[PDB]
């Protein structure tokens, strides 16, 4: 429901967001 797991997005490498919501890179994201 809140789903509250920090996680590293591997896109660009920033902590906050899982890589589809990391829309830096161009790759699930
Ligand atoms: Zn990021």
Do not use: T
Not at 2 to 19: D, F, L, M, P, Y
Not at 22 to 27: G, L, N, V
């Amino acid at each position: 429901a809140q789903q509250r797991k920090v996680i590293r997005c591997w896109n660009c490498g920033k902590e906050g967001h899982s890589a589809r919501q990391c829309r830096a890179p161009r790759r699930q994201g």
